[PDB]
Design a protein around this ligand. Structure first.
Ligand SMILES: *[C@@H]1O[C@H](CO)[C@@H](O[C@@H]2O[C@H](CO)[C@@H](O)[C@H](O)[C@H]2NC(C)=O)[C@H](O)[C@H]1NC(C)=O
Ligand SMILES: *[C@@H]1O[C@H](CO)[C@@H](O[C@@H]2O[C@H](CO)[C@@H](O)[C@H](O)[C@H]2NC(C)=O)[C@H](O)[C@H]1NC(C)=O
Ligand SMILES: *[C@@H]1O[C@H](CO)[C@@H](O[C@@H]2O[C@H](CO)[C@@H](O)[C@H](O)[C@H]2NC(C)=O)[C@H](O)[C@H]1NC(C)=O
Ligand SMILES: *[C@@H]1O[C@H](CO)[C@@H](O[C@@H]2O[C@H](CO)[C@@H](O)[C@H](O)[C@H]2NC(C)=O)[C@H](O)[C@H]1NC(C)=O
Ligand SMILES: *[C@@H]1O[C@H](CO)[C@@H](O[C@@H]2O[C@H](CO)[C@@H](O)[C@H](O)[C@H]2NC(C)=O)[C@H](O)[C@H]1NC(C)=O
Ligand SMILES: *[C@@H]1O[C@H](CO)[C@@H](O)[C@H](O)[C@H]1NC(C)=O
Lengths: 595, 98
């Protein structure tokens, strides 16, 4: 009966909040002060949380799921009843964890040695990522691109084939058709009177939104190709694809390292307020106190006053071994801490606004039950953090926060320099993200057999992304598995939808703050009505369907690409005038070796 | 490490009458199945403990409460405020209260 499930969850909601607390408090003491008497302090305290949750999970199947009427207590029950693994045979369950540990340690400890000196050998993160991000030598970028895929990616090919079979068995025992349908279960919504969403409906909404970005991406692809021919003459065709090893990093995920070759007006400095911070003696604490004044300006609460003692805003005065990585912690019981090692720079002035945005999202849904204290889907949590960073990087906000000469002149040449640096990171990553999840979805359902994995991968690079390989690759390579998110078992569609939600939030908040100009000049400071539009979504958590959360801000029930294109229309107008003598589009027949 | 000595009751058959008190420790029975004094599904111990810890956000830290309740049965009198006394003047027509 349904009233027994309510009494089940309230014993759960008070044993979990304490056991999650000290399992996360011990993870704080390891992260900010590393010993090994802290790693053993967090492994036993971490396993008491994991052993407790599988005990309550096997108690949750005593209650049926379709004999429930209240939507909230049904949502908590389905998130706890989830079997996930453990549906496999107990010798297949240990084979899967052996593969996931072997693929993870090949990626982090794989070395590449030089053919002129076999005694010098580079790892990926120090040394191989620096060549792909800084070099202008064609022959050295071609060496680092091919040798990472032929010496490390060939080890992951027999391991990734066994990984697909075991993950499809686990997904079909949980009544999905494949493992790709298991990943799309985040966006599913069942029976809330007009707000429903199918797991197959996500596939059409991604492909419908993508064919409206292809006019903008084609003009960006044509402008970068014309600028790369001056940097690498006799290597690039003026009507063809771009070679895969000249894109700024190892995989071509972000084009953000191509800015020094593709800058529109290099005689205008892109605005940088780092010298005005060290001329006014701003400490470590000023960067957060101006960040807290931004959020109280819009109508959001202060920091919790436990935030100022418990947090560790710099690396300590001790030479203290403590993972230095910006992050926002939500230990529980209303205890919010930020861990970062901040330097006096406009870079960490902006990520301070980003990391505080995770905190203000966390402080808002802290009145829901324990199992609904996440973002409404996997994409909302990063998207609310980045609309705080866009509004703080504007020169309108910088001159009113005291950091820009009240006699500063923004010219139309510097807005093109700023918008093109945004499009190399935002627009340049959208066909990479769409192509990769489309390839992984077709591998799991079996539309691509294993004798055509690397054949269909490079046909989709030339057609969707416009990127050609420099050396042909047969079915002994596995080039997707040489990325971190593929070999470490992570979903990748959250980076596509976060980019679309980010400009839907920003365009909906600037109509409430009564903006008049272009969308990229907007700032939501001093408003109250925009914050009330934002706070009505922030407090929902997972208690409502995410389509119901979007109408509280945007006014629509689906993700939309038209606010993303309105942000880049000053660039799209300027790009169509720079490509009057160029060719827009590419040919899938040209190759850098096929002459 | 958590002060686990401060408990509260989280299951009862029926809400309390005003100023009523209940220190029993019988195993609660949520479902219809009888419990027979042992724990299990739908048979819960009725007391939980605040695990208080010094690094808790406000609203999670312990507050001490005192409830004063003045009652007036039908006696002849009892405790009350304090009566202050001022100075006394002499040889002047005055308005006095002794
Ligand atoms: C890292 O934290 C641990 C524990 O928080 C520190 O180790 C000991 O902590 C106790 C407190 O319970 C002290 O009485 C001991 O003196 C600490 N050990 C030592 C060797 O000092 C540890 O000190 C912290 N790390 C550093 C570098 O201070
Ligand atoms: C079941 O649904 C009802 C409404 O559909 C929820 O009722 C609300 O409960 C809160 C506190 O529990 C009250 O403050 C509200 O006034 C109630 N609303 C109404 C319309 O009466 C109820 O909370 C849900 N059950 C659970 C366990 O959350
Ligand atoms: C979870 O996996 C189990 C198999 O281990 C599935 O079958 C359940 O088996 C248990 C006994 O171990 C029964 O109590 C359940 O009734 C069975 N399933 C149900 C509730 O029909 C079970 O179907 C899986 N649960 C999910 C999430 O589908
Ligand atoms: C920035 O604004 C100036 C001012 O309008 C633009 O200069 C004009 O450019 C057009 C097209 O080349 C000419 O027909 C006008 O005669 C120019 N104006 C003047 C006063 O000379 C300039 O092109 C703009 N730059 C960008 C990048 O948009
Ligand atoms: C936006 O908010 C800021 C912060 O309160 C306002 O800045 C104040 O501006 C006045 C006059 O411009 C100064 O006298 C104050 O010293 C400023 N306050 C601070 C804390 O620096 C700003 O005026 C607001 N914008 C509008 C349009 O009202
Ligand atoms: C936030 O804190 C400041 C001082 O730190 C205070 O003046 C302000 O009133 C606080 N905000 C609210 C809503 O009380």
């Amino acid at each position: 009966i349904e009233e027994q499930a309510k009494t089940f969850l309230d014993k759960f909601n008070h044993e979990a909040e304490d056991l999650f607390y000290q399992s996360s408090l011990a993870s704080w003491n390891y992260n900010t002060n590393i010993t090994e008497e802290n790693v053993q302090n967090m492994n036993n305290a971490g396993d008491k949380w994991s052993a407790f949750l599988k005990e309550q999970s096997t108690l949750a199947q005593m209650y049926p799921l379709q004999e429930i009427q209240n939507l909230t207590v049904k949502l908590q029950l389905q998130a706890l009843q989830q079997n996930g693994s453990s549906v496999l045979s107990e010798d297949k369950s240990k084979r899967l964890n052996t593969i996931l540990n072997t693929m993870s340690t090949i990626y982090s400890t794989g070395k590449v040695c030089n053919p002129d000196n076999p005694q010098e050998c580079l790892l990926l993160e120090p040394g191989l990522n620096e060549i792909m991000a800084n070099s202008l030598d064609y022959n050295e970028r071609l060496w680092a691109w091919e040798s990472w895929r032929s010496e490390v990616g060939k080890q992951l090919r027999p391991l990734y084939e066994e990984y697909v079979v075991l993950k499809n068995e686990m997904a079909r025992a949980n009544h999905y058709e494949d493992y790709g349908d298991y990943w799309r279960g985040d966006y599913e919504v069942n029976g809330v009177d007009g707000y429903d969403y199918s797991r197959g409906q996500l596939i059409e909404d991604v492909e419908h939104t993508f064919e409206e970005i292809k006019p903008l991406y084609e003009h960006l692809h044509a402008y970068v190709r014309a600028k790369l021919m001056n940097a690498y003459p006799s290597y690039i065709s003026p009507i063809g694809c771009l070679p895969a090893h000249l894109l700024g990093d190892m995989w071509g995920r972000f084009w953000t390292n191509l800015y020094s070759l593709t800058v529109p007006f290099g005689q205008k400095p892109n605005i940088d307020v780092t010298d005005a911070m060290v001329d006014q003696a701003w400490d470590a604490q000023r960067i957060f106190k101006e960040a807290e004044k931004f959020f109280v300006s819009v109508g959001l609460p202060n920091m919790t006053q436990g935030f100022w003692e418990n947090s560790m805003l710099t690396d300590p005065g001790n030479v203290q071994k403590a993972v230095c990585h910006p992050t926002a912690w939500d230990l529980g019981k209303g205890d919010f801490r930020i861990l970062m090692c901040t330097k006096v720079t406009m870079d960490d002035f902006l990520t301070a606004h980003h990391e505080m945005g995770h905190i203000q999202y966390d402080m808002a849904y802290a009145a829901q039950p324990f199992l609904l204290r996440n973002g409404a889907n996997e994409g909302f949590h990063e998207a609310v953090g980045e609309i705080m960073s866009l509004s703080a990087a504007t020169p309108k906000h910088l001159k009113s926060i005291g950091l820009l000469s009240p006699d500063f002149q923004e010219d139309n040449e510097t807005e093109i320099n700023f918008l093109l640096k945004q499009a190399l990171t935002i627009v340049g990553t959208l066909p990479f993200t769409y192509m990769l999840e489309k390839w992984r979805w077709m591998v799991f359902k079996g539309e691509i057999p294993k004798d055509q994995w690397m054949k269909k991968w490079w046909e989709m690079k030339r057609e969707i992304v416009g990127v050609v390989e420099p050396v042909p690759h047969d079915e002994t390579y596995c080039d997707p598995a040489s990325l971190f998110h593929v070999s470490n078992d992570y979903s990748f569609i959250r980076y596509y939808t976060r980019t679309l939600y980010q400009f839907q939030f920003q365009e909906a908040l600037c109509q409430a703050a009564k903006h008049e100009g272009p969308l990229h000049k907007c700032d939501i400071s001093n408003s109250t009505e925009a914050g009330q539009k934002l706070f009505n979504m922030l407090r929902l958590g997972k208690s409502e369907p995410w389509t119901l959360a979007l109408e509280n801000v945007v006014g629509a029930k689906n993700m939309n690409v038209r606010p993303l294109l309105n942000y880049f229309e000053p660039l799209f107008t300027w790009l169509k005038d720079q490509n009057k003598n160029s060719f827009v589009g590419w040919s899938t027949d040209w190759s850098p070796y096929a002459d | 490490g958590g002060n686990y000595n401060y408990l509260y009751r989280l299951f009862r058959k029926s809400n309390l009458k005003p100023f009523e008190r209940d220190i029993s420790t019988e195993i609660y029975q949520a479902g219809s199945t009888p419990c027979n004094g042992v724990e299990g599904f739908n048979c819960y111990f009725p007391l939980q403990s605040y695990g208080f810890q010094p690094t808790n956000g406000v609203g999670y830290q312990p507050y001490r409460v005192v409830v004063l309740s003045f009652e007036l049965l039908h006696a002849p009198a009892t405790v009350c405020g304090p009566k202050k006394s001022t100075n006394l003047v002499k040889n002047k027509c005055v308005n006095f209260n002794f």
